């Protein structure tokens, strides 16, 4: 029959979706959500056979274990055993686009199980199987019969077993396959992979059963009071003895119960659903969930017969909360949202695409911890346990059908076509009747880039219609379509209009005003953090603040999705697109995370905590003010600490409780602070502590923090005059300076600062040249290829300026000698085949004192692309252990990524200045440097620096991390000026204009001296 | 004190070149002991008696932003013409110079003053590269204003028509100058992008004969 070459058919014999079942036979144990003796687990050792097409497959295995089989963990994903590679594609489909058929050579995996099973299960109920994920068809068996067949790789698929099994031994054979007409609408950007991925179990429940329950919780306008209503339905044989009970807790308080007989009111002509009953349950002040406050209620559900016998107990945890859309806004219990969201793939480096309770508890606390308050399912129903620990942890979730065909052309082909609607609505349907009682699911998504189709408006209608209590939202054809009521682009500018014809990404804040348009908008997916990533982050977060209607966001995403691989030593290295032998392949786009796969932080991630923060200051006088965001709960888990400090030096500092109201503000009176003596600048740190631990973070945590430049004391002492006297001796080929054990020389044919000498040491290993260029971030790059050039890409408009191959031109290098010193005075011109494209003048001033003064100025031809940085570099001969510096840090900043970080004064171990990113650029900067200290040397000044092990030119040479070796010595790189790192996406130019290098004219100076 | 401020010499110096003459100055401008701003010059004066002079100015980050960064003395000399290569030919300022074009612009002198009934700063031009008045000549990239009516005169003057023309020309030429803003007159305007809050500004200028 070929079924998975036939959209028409998604299944055979599978049962029909509901919420999670557990069958408890006690309602204790139920209501205290403890293991339930009627689930089981049946994952494990398997026995797996790998097979290059379904006909390969020997009628044999259908009967007895292949011998040829290995015994693999279940669940997992075949590829991460080995058994073939992994594919990582972004929108093109990994297989010859001609649905709905698949390669012949479709790989298959062969996977069987050898089990018990107690007479008891047999003797009456029915024994179901459960998969929840396999990747991407199977056709399943037990005992050598058919059982049936399932598709959708990410959501549970059922059947009854209660005919096939017997009382002891049992055979299960399940045949997955790789490919099938189910993957047309599977072509996320993500790895390709395939097998039984998710838990396997089997369920047993009773004849006369609960086959279903919704609950709903409705309030009154103030949230007072509220209803909580829950509809059960069961399946069997119906009598009049039946009831159910529905009670609600609060720990091992009950607060409200309600029992009734089967028999629903009257529908239409035909009467009612004999097979149903809604209970209503009243509860009064109810306490309600957030993701400020994730307060919890159970509900137990019970069917039971009149006189008090249980039959089977099921539950759930009750959220009480409303979320709807009024005037605009998208309302939580009557107050506008603001989505402090990130965008979260099921990624694993070692397990692929397998997930586990450690891992979803890690990713939730990083997330809360980086105050982040809502996941979007990117781009698919997720593990059933993570809608759980969202409900209890708090996190508001955008639950995702599995649909994305990215790769037709047009992107709606298959969305739009009426043959396509089954096998897209039981994505949609059976997505909706497993999580509709989630509290934490606040939003239904349709799907991911697959265009605009017909299909999607029914499918938006019918969510609508069987579920009113959460907003539908779809991004697809154009963002803002009638099959969305939100208006959610990916990758819109904030100021920036991007009007591609037909789905134009409107810059945000223009797009709320469109004639017409009143939706709330939210970003299904923004600021693309791949590699060297998030700059403009705060442009986003401004405009969010300001705009009511722009309720946020979710950032394009939580990890990378990098795979470890191993080298002829054993020694495990991060692997992106094609590493594999996956061809064609998409290369680093794999990666696109603010955490490395291992849950590691890139710097990036503390520039969104810092944009996230709930706590807002200003500063006037001796008061701050400062202002909460919370929209529910007040400060009773915060403290602030405040400290003021003369460049780096502490001068005072103390704490104020926070009593702040949800949406309140409180003023804070600072002491008076002592003026300091010494000149500089006097700097105010305040931070919010949470002295208390929660179950999300340890006491001492640190939600926020503010600086402000106070009072500042021009120097206007000047240095005591020292009696040396700098000589100078000259060369044809040189100009040479003494001052004590101290030596500068200088190359005449170069007009470069050579070598330096401190008690006769050399101090260089590569002389000190200018630097206007840099090892390309993935911004800089965009989807440019060597084979496949993108000419508007950063890095190829350098690339044909000249700017890496321009070579530098001495125009002048003379010598002089002052009273007091001695100043060397150099000009260059860096050209590109008579082109002019830089001309830097320099002079450096050695006095007694040992000091030596670069004063640098630059022209950059207006018609030359701006240059990503103006600089100098060298390789010192110094290999010290640790770095410190007094500017901006500690972590990694660029210009338009560096709100996040403090001025003050920093130490860390060489290493720490490096950002290890997957793929090697420029990296580790650290900007509003006034002062930088390396092994003897000292630089002063106002300037932007990176110093590490690896030289630009290696870092734009090496398309690993693992590739790197530490050169010789230190290399240097200072800048006066550094380009954005952009990142609104990373496909096309996005440093905005304030952050290009586009004066024409840049000026800064620099003192070199030994400390 | 922006207006009460004393220049306070802190260093001047002076060195022969190969081929130049290098005179080094830094002063401090100070009120009631607080430092608000600090100037380091450099004139170097060549065998083409060009004088090239490059100024650095720091200004104390908890002063309010400055009107300008720049220079100016009172010419002796009264021209007819005033010849610059920047933007005109009509006075414009930083936040209001979109309709003012790049070219060469030769007007009388009197043109280069705006009558406001409120006598204020008047009549800059901004991006001008070259500067021609009289014998002299200014090359560089700045802003200028020039007339016969000091700055003093002007802030002291309630009408126009109580102004008089001065001894000479009063020259100002600023590497920087804030913007006037406008959204409204009753409050602050000047928008964040045209104050000078850079803490530290370079400009540099080269006087000859022309
Ligand atoms: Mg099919
Ligand atoms: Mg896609
Ligand atoms: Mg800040
Ligand atoms: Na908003
Ligand atoms: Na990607
Ligand atoms: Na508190
Ligand atoms: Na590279
Ligand atoms: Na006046």
Not at 17 to 39: G, I, M, V, Y
Not at 177 to 192: A, F, I, K, P, V
Not at 384 to 412: F, Q
Not at 812 to 826: E, G, K
């Amino acid at each position: 029959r070929r079924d998975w070459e036939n959209p028409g058919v998604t299944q055979l014999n599978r049962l029909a979706a509901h919420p999670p079942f557990a069958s408890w036979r006690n309602s204790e144990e139920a209501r205290t959500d403890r293991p339930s003796q009627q689930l089981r687990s049946l994952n494990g050792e398997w026995r797996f056979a790998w097979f290059p097409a379904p006909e390969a497959v020997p009628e044999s295995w259908l009967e007895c274990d292949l011998p040829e089989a290995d015994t693999v963990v279940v669940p997992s994903n075949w590829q991460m055993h080995g058994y073939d590679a992994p594919i990582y594609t972004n929108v093109t489909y990994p297989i010859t686009v001609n649905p709905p058929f698949v390669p012949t050579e479709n790989p298959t995996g062969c996977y069987s199980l050898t089990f018990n099973v107690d007479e008891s299960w047999l003797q009456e109920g029915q024994t179901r199987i459960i998969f929840d994920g396999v990747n991407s068809a199977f056709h399943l068996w037990c005992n050598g019969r058919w059982v049936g067949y399932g598709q959708d790789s990410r959501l549970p698929s059922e059947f009854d077993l209660s005919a096939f099994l017997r009382a002891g031994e049992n055979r299960l054979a399940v045949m997955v396959l790789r490919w099938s007409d189910g993957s047309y609408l599977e072509d996320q950007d993500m790895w390709r992979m395939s097998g039984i991925f998710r838990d396997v179990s089997l369920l047993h429940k009773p004849t006369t059963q609960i086959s279903d329950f919704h609950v709903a919780t409705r309030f009154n306008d103030d949230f007072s009071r509220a209803v909580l209503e829950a509809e059960v339905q069961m399946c069997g044989e119906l009598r009049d003895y039946l009831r159910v009970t529905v009670s609600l807790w609060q720990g091992e308080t009950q607060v409200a119960s309600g029992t009734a007989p089967f028999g629903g009111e009257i529908i239409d002509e035909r009467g009612g659903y004999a097979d149903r009953v809604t209970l209503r349950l009243n509860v009064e002040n109810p306490k309600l969930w957030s993701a400020e406050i994730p307060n919890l209620y159970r509900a137990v559900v019970e069917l039971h017969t009149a006189d008090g016998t249980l039959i089977e107990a099921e539950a759930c945890d009750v959220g009480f909360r409303e979320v709807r859309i009024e005037n605009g806004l998208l309302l939580l219990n009557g107050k506008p949202l603001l989505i402090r969201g990130v965008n979260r793939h099921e990624h694993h480096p070692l397990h692929g695409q397998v997930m586990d309770e450690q891992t979803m508890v890690q990713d939730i606390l990083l997330m809360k911890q980086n105050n982040f308050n809502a996941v979007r399912c990117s781009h698919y129903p997720n593990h059933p346990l993570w809608y759980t620990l969202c409900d209890r942890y708090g996190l508001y979730v955008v639950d995702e059908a599995n649909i994305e065909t990215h790769g037709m052309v047009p992107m709606n082909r298959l969305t739009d076509d009426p043959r396509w609607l089954p096998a897209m609505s039981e994505r949609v349907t059976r997505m909706v009747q497993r999580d509709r009682n989630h509290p934490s699911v606040i939003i239904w998504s349709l799907g991911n880039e697959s265009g605009h189709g017909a299909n999607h408006d029914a499918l938006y209608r019918w969510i609508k219609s069987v579920d009113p209590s959460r907003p539908v939202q779809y991004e697809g054809g154009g963002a803002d379509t009638t099959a969305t009521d939100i208006i959610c682009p990916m990758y819109a500018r904030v100021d920036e209009d991007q009007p591609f014809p037909a789905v134009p990404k409107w810059s945000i804040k223009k797009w709320l005003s469109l004639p017409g348009e009143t939706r709330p908008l939210i970003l299904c997916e923004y600021a693309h953090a791949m590699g060297n990533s998030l700059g403009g982050f705060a442009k986003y977060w401004q405009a969010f603040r300001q705009y009511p209607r722009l309720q946020g966001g979710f950032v394009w995403d939580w990890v990378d999705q990098s795979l470890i691989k191993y080298d002829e030593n054993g020694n495990p290295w991060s692997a992106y697109g094609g590493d594999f032998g996956d061809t064609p392949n998409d290369a680093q786009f794999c990666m696109n995370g603010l955490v490395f796969a291992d849950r590691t932080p890139h710097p990036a991630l503390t520039e969104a905590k810092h944009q996230q923060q709930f706590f807002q200051f200003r500063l006037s006088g001796q008061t701050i003010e400062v202002t909460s965001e919370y929209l529910f709960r007040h400060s009773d888990n915060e403290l602030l600490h405040w400290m003021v400090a003369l460049d780096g030096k502490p001068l005072a500092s103390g704490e104020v409780p926070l009593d702040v109201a949800p949406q309140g503000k409180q003023l804070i009176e600072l002491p008076e602070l002592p003026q300091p003596e010494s000149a500089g600048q006097l700097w105010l740190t305040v931070r919010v502590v949470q002295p208390n631990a929660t179950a999300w973070s340890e006491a001492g945590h640190i939600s926020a923090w503010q600086q402000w430049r106070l009072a500042e004391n021009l120097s206007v002492t000047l240095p005591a005059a020292s009696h040396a006297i700098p000589h100078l001796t000259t060369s044809e080929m040189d100009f040479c300076i003494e001052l004590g054990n101290k030596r500068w020389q200088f190359n005449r044919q170069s007009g470069f600062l050579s070598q330096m000498w401190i008690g006769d040491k050399k101090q260089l290993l590569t002389p000190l040249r200018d630097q206007f260029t840099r090892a390309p971030l993935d911004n800089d790059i965009g989807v440019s290829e060597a084979t496949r050039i993108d000419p508007n890409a950063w890095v190829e408009r350098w690339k044909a300026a000249g700017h890496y191959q321009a070579e530098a031109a001495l125009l002048q290098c003379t010598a002089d000698t002052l009273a007091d010193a001695v100043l060397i005075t150099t000009a260059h011109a860096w050209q590109h085949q008579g082109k002019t494209l830089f001309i830097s003048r320099k002079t450096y001033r050695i006095d007694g004192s040992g000091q030596m003064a670069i004063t640098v100025d630059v022209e950059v031809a207006s018609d030359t692309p701006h240059p990503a940085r103006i600089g100098l570099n060298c390789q010192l001969a110094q290999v010290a252990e640790r770095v410190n510096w007094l500017g901006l840090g500690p972590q990694e900043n660029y210009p338009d990524r560096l709100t996040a970080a403090c001025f003050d004064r920093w130490d860390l171990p060489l290493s720490d200045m490096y950002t290890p990113y997957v793929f090697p650029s420029e990296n580790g900067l650290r900007c509003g440097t006034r002062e930088l200290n390396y092994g003897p040397h000292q630089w002063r000044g106002d300037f932007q620096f990176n110093i590490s092990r690896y030289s630009q030119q290696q870092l734009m040479e090496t398309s690993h991390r693992h590739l790197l070796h530490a050169e010789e010595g230190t290399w240097l790189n200072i800048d006066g000026f550094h380009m954005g790192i952009g990142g609104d996406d990373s496909w096309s130019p996005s440093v905005s204009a304030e952050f290009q290098l586009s004066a024409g004219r840049y000026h800064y100076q620099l003192v070199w001296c030994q400390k």
